[PDB]
Point group: C2
Chain length 71, copies 2
């Protein structure tokens, strides 16, 4: 994905996370360790590729439609 | 992405395409060549990775919400 797309997708992932009062540590705890803070952080910065499958899994985790996370 | 996820995502991409009466050639024509028949075909079989950005672009092209294409 383009740098801009990855950056914007990561920004929405960060916004949705913070919006429901979760820190990266909080995400790791709530997900029983499935979603590691370091990994989610990398997705949010756009430093690591977020696959469609992963995006769908995160959307479900956060309780929001995939559309809300799309740039 | 898992083989099953890629396969299912491709199946929905194929279903939506055919549903609106477009052949792979038709897609290449309607998209002025942006979406090549060989490439879209590979996405449909799950032989080539479909990025989130690409999925969003295809959803727009087909005129359907991204959700309709998600396994």
């Amino acid at each position: 994905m383009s740098s801009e797309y990855a950056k914007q997708l990561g920004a929405k992932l960060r916004a949705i996370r913070t919006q429901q009062g979760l820190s990266l540590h909080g995400v790791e705890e709530k997900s029983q360790g499935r979603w590691k803070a370091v990994v989610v952080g990398s997705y949010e910065r756009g430093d690591r590729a977020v696959t469609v499958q992963r995006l769908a899994e995160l959307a479900d985790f956060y309780g929001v439609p995939v559309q809300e996370l799309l740039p």
